[model samples]
Target chain A: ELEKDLRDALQRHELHLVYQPQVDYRDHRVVGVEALLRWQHPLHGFVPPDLFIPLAEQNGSIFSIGEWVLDQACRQLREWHDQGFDDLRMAVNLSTVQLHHNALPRVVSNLLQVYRLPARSLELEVTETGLMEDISTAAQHLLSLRRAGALIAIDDFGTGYSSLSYLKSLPLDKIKIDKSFVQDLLQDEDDATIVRAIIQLGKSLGMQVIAEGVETAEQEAYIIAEGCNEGQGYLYSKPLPARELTQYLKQARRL
Target chain B: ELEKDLRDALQRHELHLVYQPQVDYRDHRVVGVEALLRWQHPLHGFVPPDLFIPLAEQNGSIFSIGEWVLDQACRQLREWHDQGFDDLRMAVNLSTVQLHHNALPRVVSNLLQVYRLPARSLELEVTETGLMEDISTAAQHLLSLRRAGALIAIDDFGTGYSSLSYLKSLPLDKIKIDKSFVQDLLQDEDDATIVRAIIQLGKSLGMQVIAEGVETAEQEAYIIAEGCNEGQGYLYSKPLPARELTQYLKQARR
Candidate 1:
């Protein structure tokens, strides 16, 4: 029943992007927010990406949502950037299945050029272990993305057997510390080590390390001390509707 | 007839191990060897792994073969390490279906204890692109493998997006560059760039970078110049049978 409404809600314009701020560690400022998808059903009110992301993946709805998300996020980011507000790097999340298409390169390139968004400001966040059945092709696509100036990141670090060799072999700019580590880095020793290790490694590799799920100052302080330069989570802010995010953008200068 | 002989003949003699060296570029030495499974068919002479491998993967014969490969490779490397082969690494290929079984970690632990091999000496190579319908459990098993100290490398670097990210999140030691790049690295600047990029990134991230199919010195020199430190291909050596490998290992030291 709820699924039906969610689908209908898609048609009825219930699905939307909620922006979450990604902090740039170098400046200790909110660099940009990744546009996360939110589904507002007529009856269900709201659906989290973690809840329905898998469901959509199972039914090929992920591809559809992926397209819409790309289009909407690109358009929105481009608009804001053009308005002279701020050039926040808006990360667009992707499912590996979406790359099965041969047109991925063109689609991405077209989107970047069409919007006039600086390639460096447009980032694509692929899961740490991308669903790329063809890691070689995926490597190729990622190299293509890098050559184009749009950056690639391994979202959710330490979650899979993504080859550090492949990580080296491709052109990547960042590794977003998975939320699982951030969620527990404050309490668990092992988790703390993983967070520290990730930040240290990210720094050594010349990649920006983002600790996701930072909800408090202590958590922020711990990661900051570990040399982690970037972060995203409920600590600084939650996913905000465009209106709130726009205002936050105007004033979010410190911390 | 050959296929039939492969199945029925396995009942007669044990399959043997073939070691193909994965070269280390920084010093131009063998860092590791992938244990290639070979069936010593009494009547069929020798069956290509590509043929019998799928057979094992399907009929559950691989359970026995997979275990043997690990036990044998671990024993061989451990033997060498004990005999002063200090800089060596052993990588065993894994099948998707085998990972499906929850018993993988236990089996590896038991084998490690039995053979007295350190987890760091062994690397488990898993292909990133098998179209397995269920990956969540497979990931748990791989994580377990990592927790046990066995180095994990993504084998056949590309071909499937079905579960690339899932593979990335698993505790891993390295990613093996697929031979596909070798197939066209020279023809396509894009492919060469990818190979170069992966190797550079591997160094940056502190993971070992191994290029497969380093067919010629040109390729080897190319990868080495690009800072790719590890490699494998026919140029280093073919997958030698146990006796040949044992002999080669003797000569290789010189």
Candidate 2:
């Protein structure tokens, strides 16, 4: 019933995007924003992504939904660029089904052309498990997207069982350390070791590393000291609506 | 016809094993012998393993052949152990079909017991590509074998497209750099860089790194300088038959 409602929600415009700032914690500067999907179901209240996205994937609706996300994120990026935030990048997540589609690079290329945006201004994030689903196909699609000038990042990295061989073979620009590991950086020794290894591995492989779900000043300082290039969490700000993010952006520029 | 012949060859005693010495180059001492399979066809004379192994895999005969290899290698290890080379280890290659079997760990454990050899005295070598064929299953099999006290090594390391994730997740004890990379390590800068990265990566993960095809003194010195733990190739000895290897071993002890 909720799946049907989600399908209706997309058409009824109940679905929307919220932007979460990815900050350079060293300078407290907003470098990018991730376009997070939200479904404001009329009957059920807010349907969380974790609940609806999987349903969409199961129902074979993620392809269309994923395309909508790419287009909307790119359209918003263009609007932000016109508002004088030319350096800001917009990140959007890709579902495994969308990534496996052979036309993904072409679709992304077309979207960038339609938006009159540089391909480099868009970042596509795929989970490690998704990439592992079909590595050869994923590698081909990622290479094409990367060659066309977009950044590729692995989301929730340490949570999946992927071989390091993909790190050398894939065209990746960044690795986002899963929030589960970063959230307990000071409290758990194993988490700390994993975080450190990821940072070392990413930097050694010449990729940027970001920490997610950093909700405290101590967490931010610890990751910064450990050579994390970027971070996202409640310590920065909750996901803001488009108009509110503009206000946040404007205020952030002042500081 | 060749596939049919291979099946028959295994039963007719036309198939055999050759032992290649894996050495610690720093002191020139033998550490282990890789049990390489050979086929002496009655009509064709000799069939290279590269040709027959894949045929066996395709014909669904590799499981039987792989089991034969393990049993024979372990039996040889036992014979050598009794001959006073108690520290010598025996290594055997596994087929992808053999590895994906859920019963692989039990088969290996039973072989070690039947031969009356310690699990630590045998090493199972699987190609990197084979391990990637079904990683989750491979990991489970490897972990079970490792917990049983056997050592696992990834054969032909740099040649395959495997993720570094497996190195951390799987239970591996050693990595054998492919001969193709080691053959031209000095002349090819890319090969040299790869050799260096693999050695460093293996060592950092606390796994022994062995270089294959070290044919020259220059190659030997180069890998030794870069910290490779063991080597195998023409510089030491070629694959020898069982009796010849015994003679070689007896002479070496002197």
lDDT of 2 by residue, A34-53 (tens): 99999987788899888998
Give one digit per residue, the lDDT tens place, for model 1 in A15-70.
89899988776777878789988987766678877777777777767777787888
lDDT of 2 by residue, B1-254 (tens): 88899876778988899999999866779989999999999899899888999999888878888888898888998999999998899999988888898788999999988888876789999987788788889988998998877899999887665654456668889999989889988898657766776776666566799999989889999888888999999888889999999988889988
Stretches off by above 4 angstroms in model 1 are A7-16, A39-44, A51-79, A82-86, A94-115, A128-130, A133-154, A157-173, A193-207, A225-227, A253-255, B10-51, B56-254
lDDT of 1 by residue, B1-254 (tens): 55455554445655778889877766777778788887766655677877887777767777776777788888888777777777688888888767677788998888778877765878888775542446677667777887887878877775433232343355767867778876577777657766765665466455677888888888888887877778888988988876776677778787
For model 2 the local lDDT of residue A94 reads: 92
Q: Candidate 2, after superposition: displacement of residue B66 in Å?
A: 2.7
Best candidate (score: TM-score): 2
Per-residue lDDT, model 2, residue B148, is 75
Looking at model 2, the pairs that clash are A163-B163, A163-B164, A163-B165, A164-B163, A164-B164, A164-B165, A165-B162, A165-B163, A165-B164
**What is model 1's DockQ versus the real complex?**
0.08
Query: By summed lDDT, which 10 consecutive residues of candidate 2 chain B come out lowest?
Result: B160-169
Label model 2 with its docking quality class: incorrect
Candidate models: Cα lDDT each: 0.74, 0.85
